[PDB]
């Protein structure tokens, strides 16, 4: 028996494919389904992704933003059904995989450290050309 | 209850 194959088999029902690729440093908007009372609605959470854990169906990523003077980080599962869609708002280039260091940096300092990933931007315009 | 020690502490 193949234990890995059998696990992957269970997971395949829930595996998601509509979500766009992104990297630590990209600025991203996540449309997340949220329940409040007595309805469910879609709230947007948009910030820099500072982390991507990888583990097959169980990869999760972490988006950080400042909200009304307070820093807020969110952790989403990449295959969570409660994510309506993900919108790349900007490609930024980090030299690292995990960007915990930006938690301690001023807005100016961050802007210098996270320059625009010009390569993956033109590359995004290279697609996005419909036939 | 503090009662007086009956032994000295041992010496080398």
């Amino acid at each position: 028996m193949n234990r890995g194959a059998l696990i992957k088999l269970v997971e395949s029902r829930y595996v998601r494919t509509d979500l766009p690729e992104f990297r630590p440093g990209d600025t991203v908007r996540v449309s997340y389904k949220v329940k409040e009372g007595n309805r469910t609605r879609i709230q947007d959470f948009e910030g820099i992704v500072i982390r991507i854990r990888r583990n097959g169906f169980n990869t999760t990523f972490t988006v950080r933003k400042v909200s009304y003077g307070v820093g807020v980080e969110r952790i989403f599962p990449l295959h969570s059904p409660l994510i309506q869609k993900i919108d790349i708002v900007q490609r930024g280039r980090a030299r690292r995989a995990k960007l915990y260091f930006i938690r301690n940096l001023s807005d100016r300092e961050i802007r210098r450290k996270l320059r625009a990933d010009r390569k993956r931007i033109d590359q995004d315009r290279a697609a996005e050309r419909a036939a | 209850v503090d009662k007086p020690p009956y032994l000295p502490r041992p010496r080398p």
Partner: protein, 122 residues
């Protein structure tokens, strides 16, 4: 994860600035208060001529924590500081405004008045 000795930023305009938890009000021996819990706290730092002054022993509900909180949808949320909002014994906020986002858990736990006053709920 707020426990006795923890300092909390107050996120209202009661005049308090910094409170220090001295008991987490959640049963006979709660170890930590999280989002939506009430604590008893001493006011360690406050602004002049507020409703509340330095030294007062007030109650407050925790509105955001630096230790991330987990949600049944598999996600979680973490804030840059530990914050609370000072309340009266009827769980109503004592200030007239609240500053910064608050955790959605406040709604479920029946703190509607504070949620409605907050600029953002995450």
């Amino acid at each position: 994860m707020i426990q006795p000795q923890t300092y909390l930023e107050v996120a209202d305009n009661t005049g308090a600035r910094k409170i220090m938890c001295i008991r987490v009000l959640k049963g006979s021996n709660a170890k930590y208060a999280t989002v939506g819990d009430v604590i008893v706290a001493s006011v360690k730092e406050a602004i002049p001529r507020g409703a509340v002054k330095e030294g007062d022993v007030v109650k407050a509900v925790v509105v955001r924590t630096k230790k991330e909180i987990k949600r049944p949808d598999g996600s979680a949320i973490r804030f840059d500081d530990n914050a609370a909002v000072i309340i009266n014994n009827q769980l109503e906020p004592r200030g007239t405004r609240v500053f910064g986002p608050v955790a959605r858990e406040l709604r479920e736990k029946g703190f509607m008045k504070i949620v409605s006053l907050a600029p953002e709920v995450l």
